[PDB]
Amino acid sequence: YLVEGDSAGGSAKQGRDRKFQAILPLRGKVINTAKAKMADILKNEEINTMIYTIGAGVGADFSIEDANYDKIIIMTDADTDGAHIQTLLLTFFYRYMRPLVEAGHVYIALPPLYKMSKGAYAWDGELEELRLQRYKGLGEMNADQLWETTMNPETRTLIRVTIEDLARAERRVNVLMGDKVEPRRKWIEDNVKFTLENIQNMSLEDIMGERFGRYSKYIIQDRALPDIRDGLKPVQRRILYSMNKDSNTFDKSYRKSAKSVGNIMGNFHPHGDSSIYDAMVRMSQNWKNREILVEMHGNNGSMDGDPPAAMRYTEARLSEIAGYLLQDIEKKTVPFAWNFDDTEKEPTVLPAAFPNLLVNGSTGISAGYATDIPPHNLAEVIDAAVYMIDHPTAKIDKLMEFLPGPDFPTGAIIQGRDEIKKAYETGKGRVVVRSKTEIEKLKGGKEQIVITEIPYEINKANLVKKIDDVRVNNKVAGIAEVRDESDRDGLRIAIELKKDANTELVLNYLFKYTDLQINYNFNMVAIDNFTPRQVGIVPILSSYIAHRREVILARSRFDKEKAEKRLHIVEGLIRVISILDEVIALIRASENKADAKENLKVSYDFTEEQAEAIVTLQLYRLTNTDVVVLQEEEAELREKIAMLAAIIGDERTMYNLMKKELREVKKKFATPRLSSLED
Amino acid sequence: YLVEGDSAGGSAKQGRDRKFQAILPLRGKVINTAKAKMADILKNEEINTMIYTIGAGVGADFSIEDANYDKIIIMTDADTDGAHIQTLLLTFFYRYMRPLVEAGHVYIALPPLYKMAWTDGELEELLQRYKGLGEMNADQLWETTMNPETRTLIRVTIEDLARAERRVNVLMGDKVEPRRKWIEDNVKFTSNIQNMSLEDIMGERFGRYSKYIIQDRALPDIRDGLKPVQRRILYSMNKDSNTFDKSYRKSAKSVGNIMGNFHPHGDSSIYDAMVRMSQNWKNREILVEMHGNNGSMDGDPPAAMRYTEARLSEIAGYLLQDIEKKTVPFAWNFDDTEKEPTVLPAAFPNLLVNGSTGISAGYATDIPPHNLAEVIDAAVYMIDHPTAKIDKLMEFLPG
Amino acid sequence: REVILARSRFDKEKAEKRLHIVEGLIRVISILDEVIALIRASENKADAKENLKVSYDFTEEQAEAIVTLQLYRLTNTDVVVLQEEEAELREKIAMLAAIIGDERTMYNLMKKELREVKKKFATPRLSSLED
DNA sequence: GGTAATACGGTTATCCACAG
DNA sequence: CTGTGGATAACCGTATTACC
Ligand SMILES: [Mg+2]
Ligand SMILES: [Mg+2]
């Protein structure tokens, strides 16, 4: 039994029949033995101990008859990453112990993902025909459960891999697991449906099919790529939503991170506290995000790349603009959905009162797709969205009057306008990004280059170091000293030169051969209707706009319905201030809460709503009985209800609402450019 | 600047003036240079890194003139484990680099523990608690502790050599008895550069560590039988209504709660405690029911906290009986955000039933488990026989 | 001991605040028709309570209790029922004060609850003893 | 030379795309 | 061959008492 990690190894070792069943635990994900050379492939711990533990040799030196076991069962967890491993491993026994695979000795264990409580297991159709707990991994199952449901011969089911049409198998392991992304992506497009989908043999091709498809789809939709609307990946949305639900906002205390992480992993995000804290930290670093979404107290990283305080230390809390990412989430504005567990519902997208995806950016490594979208200036983005609200048909050159190019939080200089255009047109382009520098004439007569902004996502330490590395290797002459002078109130790298040293030469060699100047490649993929799309500035801005339409609309309906309800109650309270002594003597007349409501409804034609309201009143209320205040309430109610009705009804009314709010956000948060542009 | 690990090393590194200040991160507790073989003290990685960084040579080969720095500043987190590291480092300097401590070159840094304040006498005269330097932002660190203008630094000196070799060798010595004596004696359980003798620094510091590690960690309370971590676990679990009669709950949530609301320490320690509390070959009457992998008598590691769910057991219910009905002393927590009980109602005698074990400083504890029945027998007998002698009691509590 | 005591002091104090409130409630049913009317023109909640006190010798506990009664509860006017509650409360307050005053009733309870726990949870011996 | 249990620290290898 | 960021999985140094 091949098992991932030692915690699953525990459940296995304890559930197993110890006479004829072994367990080999595996640290992590297994090496892709179709993507790396036989060099690394043979120098790999897991691989090696796997060859050993099976004892029959790899490659052409493999003997089916020297094999220590009859069956080689891959029992990974039931989840996505489980499936991906079933893949990687299946593509190692195909590429290196093929006779094992061909002879029908590699099987795949089918443990369950869920379980019921009445107070019945779950492999979607018998969980309905028999009348929850999602298993993170094996180690969440108790040993007897593992045994009776998956490890026991008399009871278990097993999928039995067999190579049926050899050549086709070869083709498939090649598309899916090989080095060239292209055919893998075509395969996904052609096969994966992003909307919405004892012993028993399946072919290598089919098994590899389902498992990779499952991995691919989940990892595209639900991990790596952002939503084209709110611009967030699942983990970031879940962080914002859970923190906000817990009242941890900008206007209150800070709060110890590891509580937050514990909750986020308790309620929304079934993965390591590692990934969660990591994401939460990144959201707090003003040199990674252009507009930060989380404020953190304490060591939260730095441009040198030093580790943030481990999560036991650092206080955190939502920023202010994040609130604007979640405004009106309470007014039924956005699609919710059950979490992994079914304890709670969670949002699938946020209202997003500002256009995040273009402002903060996204990056970006999925499977078959990968995204890279630079940040922009909140002002400029809003300006374009607002022009496009009045001008659906707008062309790129025009919009670029408002959206000239990216605005990195790390400043610098961006060269390449035709390519910024190319990328806003198509989603893909290449641009150059160059550091800010002054030249500094020092005492004596020696010049000194002072770098003061560096390229986006460049490690400052690494850089300074790779420059001193140019010095001591005399890759060019000039550099007398290289010294990081950065501090509390600035970023300053002083490259001091010798007397007589071509400063222009040194500078150019530096831009050429170090990361003082790099390329940014746009690759703007986002999830737009459940499938990945490569998009220019237009489907992004459009998508945004229509989102805000839907949000505003559902909001206006929620408020209007609320309003109506209230109006319909006051309409009762007034017409019961009239027949008061009668209604009191009637509730006193009645017998028990239901007879009182039924009687309030029979004897004076109140509704359920109005009945419950009146009967559920308090005695101290009866003191104040002024119908003029109620009438003012009723009136205001009516005017509101009307303007709501107007927003829901009239289109241009709603688009102006959109623009007013947007211009309000812009006014509040507008910050000046940091990245200068050059053509 | 000697700092305790890379988390605090961050803030150190940032908030520092780079022209003259250096930062050496140490990875944990420093080795005790009194208790260890010279084989070990030789091989110890951090020891070597310090002996090179200070660049002067150890002990007998120590040349004061070759000191790369005028001041060697000790900056540990403000809490107790802090003071204990201060202690270990200090004895190392006393031992294998004496004339540095003799010249007054070894200074101790003074970070604040809380805010709105040092100590606990001046804070009461007025609220976050810095559980390690890594949740202090760099500006704060500079202003409060690293700025040669603003800061305050304890300035360690050997003021009477004879009266020093004793204290170090007693508080750090291999032999326990003299330490225990010292503790029983001195520990009561209930300014730009200030100078202080080694005797008094090592004194007050080891006093702090010892007192905390005895009172609030390693030894159990003679009434509910719990060490504090176990107590916050049962209390918090029960507050969230994570009880025996209601569907297990991802431990990894419970632990975040415990760390943020009650137990300001590393997840590791907390989850490990909760799990041991679920293992029925360690506990005679388990207090936590846990679901999934939670170890074996072979010791295979429990599933990590991401995996297993848990709830209180039924009988833990009784350990918590009537807690709501103002039946037990509460106190504020590390935050001053919430109240936690200081001892539980204990509707059975847990200290004898599940036992305890058992390592602090000067004291260790080993009390083996017993039968819940038999202990309850003896308890009832004693209730009607205040003066009961051991031999009669053993007719109920054989062993 | 300390626990059983303080627990008992808690249970008593609660039973008593209740008792007090129910006696109040009974009296309110007696003079019931003008309670309403006195509130009905009494400026506000505050002056409603003030007017209940400075006119009917009510207590603030009974006052806030009355004036914030739900309207649908003016259905239930059953006096004998509230009187039965009054009975049970009195018996409880008795027992509890007994525990607090008789340092022998208390210890007997202690024994009671301890043996209760024994029947609920006792399991057999496991490590055998040899000398 | 070993382990006991509650504390203090930190670290590494994998997949995925896409760049020079 | 390196780094990007959201995922998988492990790993081990130190203190403290105590006893062969
Ligand atoms: Mg370059
Ligand atoms: Mg690169």
Whole-angstrom Cα distance, residue A4 to residue A82? 8
Same domain, A584 and A637: yes
Q: Are residues A202 and A275 in the same domain?
A: no
**Of residues 286 to 315 in chain A, which lie within 7 A of strand E by their beta carbon?**
288, 305
Q: A484: which strand partners?
A: A493
**Do A380 and A293 fall into the same domain?**
yes
Report whether the peptide linkage leading into residue B173 is cis, meaning its omega lies within 30 degrees of zero: no
Ligand nearest to the CA of A519: 1
Q: Enumerate the residues of chain B whose CB falls inside 8 A of the CB of residue C11.
A: 325
Using CB atoms and an 8 Å cut-off, which of residues 116-155 of chain A contact chain B? Answer: 117, 133, 136-142
Provide the token pair at B29: 């507790």
Closest CB to B383 among C111, C121, C122: C111
CA–C1' A97–D9 (A): 43
Q: How many CA atoms lie within 13 A of B299 on its CB side?
A: 0
DSSP-assigned beta bridge partners for residue A295: A317
Torsion of CA A369, A375, A380, A382, to 10 degrees: 60
Residue B343's closest chain C neighbor by CA? C3
Determine, for residues C111 and B384 on separate chains, whether the beta-carbon distance falls below 8 Å: yes
CB B101 within 8 A of CB B28: no
How far is Cα C76 from Cα A662, in angstroms, rounded to an integer? 56
Window 303-332 of B: residues touching A by CB (8 A cutoff) are: 303-304, 306-309
* Angle between helices A580-589 and A608-615 in degrees, nearest 10: 80
- Contact call for C36 and A622, based on CB within 8 A: yes
CB B387 within 8 A of CB B245: no
- Residue-number span of the structural domain to which A156 is assigned: 1-223
Residue A518 alpha carbon to ligand 2 centre in Å: 8
**Cβ-Cβ contacts under 8 Å for B165 (sequence gap 6 or more):** none
Per-residue 3-state assignment (H helix, E strand, C coil) for B328-382: CCEEECCCCCCEEECCCCCCCCHHHHCCEEEECCCCEEEECCCCHHHHHHHHHHH
SS3 state of residue B188: coil
Same domain? A412 vs A437: yes
Centroid of ligand 1 to alpha carbon of A458 (angstroms): 11
Residue with tokens 């490569």: A534
- Report the 10 Å Cβ neighbour count for A160: 17
Residue for token pair 């630079």: A374
Residue type, A442: L
Distance B242 CA to E2 C1' (A): 48
What DSSP letter does each residue of A299-368 carry, written as one string? ----TT-PPPPPTTT-EEEE-HHHHHHSTTTTSS-S-EEE-SSSS-EEESS---SS-HHHHT-EE---SS
**Alpha-carbon torsion, ordered A11, A16, A22, A27, to 10 deg:** -10
CA distance A225 to A406: 19
State the burial class of residue A583 (Cβ atoms within 10 Å of its Cβ: 0-12, 13-18, 19+). buried
CA distance to partner chain A, nearest, from residue C71 (Å): 5
Three-class DSSP category at B310? strand
Q: Are residues A410 and A474 in the same domain?
A: yes
**C127–B325 C-beta distance less than 8 A:** no
Of C110, C118, C127, the CB nearest to B383: C110
Q: What's the Å distance between residue C12 CA and nucleotide D14 C1'?
A: 64
**Cα–Cα nearest to B262, from B129, B105, B356:** B129
- CA torsion sign for A181, A182, A185, A186 is negative
Task: Say whether both A484 and A342 belong to one domain.
Answer: yes
- How many helices (H) and strands (E) chain B has is answered by 16, 13
CA atoms A644, A650, A651, A655: torsion sign: negative
Please count the residues of chain B: 399
Residue A677 belongs to what H/E stretch? strand A676-678
Residue contact B325–C11, C-beta within 8 A: yes
Nucleotide nearest to A428 (CA to C1'): D18
Going by C-alpha positions, the residue among A442, A412, A421 that lies closest to residue A503 is A442
State both tokens at A298: 């304490």
Provide the number of CB pairs (under 8 Å) joining chain A to chain C.
62
Contact A615 C72 (CB under 8 A): yes
Nearest to A117 among B247, B292, B307 (CB): B247
Q: How far apart are CA B71 and CA B109, in angstroms?
A: 11
Distance A272 CA to E7 C1' (A): 8
Parallel, antiparallel or unpaired: strands B2-4 and B24-26: parallel
Cβ contacts of C12 on chain B, cutoff 8 Å: none
Which bases of chain D are under 7 A from a protein CB atom?
A: 4-11, 13-20
Q: Which CATH number fits domain B1-217: 3.40.190.10, 3.40.47.10, 3.40.50.670, 2.40.37.10?
A: 3.40.50.670
Do the chains contact at C117 and B327, CB–CB below 8 Å? no
Residues A604 and A643 occupy one common structural domain: yes
Element (H, E) at A52: helix A45-54
> Can you give the distance from the CA of residue C101 to the C1' of nucleotide E5 in angstroms?
69
Of B345, B373, B399, the CB nearest to C129: B399
> Judged by CB atoms within 8 Å, which residues 120-139 of B form the interface with A?
128, 131-139
Counting one residue from A and one from B, how many pairs have CB atoms under 8 Å apart?
Answer: 161
Angle, alpha carbons B379-B381-B386 (nearest 5°): 90
Residues A280 and A322 in one domain: yes
| Cα→Cα distances A256→A280, B238, B334, Å | 12, 21, 12
Of all nucleotides in the shown strands, which has a C1' nearest the CA of A81? E8
What was the elucidation method?
X-ray
With a CB cutoff of 8 Å and minimum separation 6, the contacts of A405 are A414, A417, A420, A431, A675, A677
Residues B267/B334, Cβ–Cβ less than 8 Å: no
Using CA atoms, how far apart are residues B313 and B107, in angstroms rounded to an integer?
51
Q: Where does a domain end: A223, A248, A265? A: A223
- Which residue matches tokens 């919430």? B338
Do both A383 and A283 map to the same domain?
A: yes
Amino acid at position B104, single letter = G
- Tell me how far apart the alpha carbons of residues A317 and A260 are, in angstroms, rounded to a whole number: 9
Final residue of a structural domain among A202, A223, A244? A223
Strands (E), A510-593: 517-523, 525-527, 532-534
Contact (CB<8Å) B267/A258: yes
Count of the separate structural domains present in chain A: 2
| 3-state DSSP helix/strand/coil % of chain C, to nearest 5 | 75, 0, 25
CB-side neighbour CA atoms (13 Å) of B1: 32
Is B397 part of the contact surface with chain C (CB cutoff 8 Å)?
Answer: no
Is the domain of A317 the same as that of A335? yes
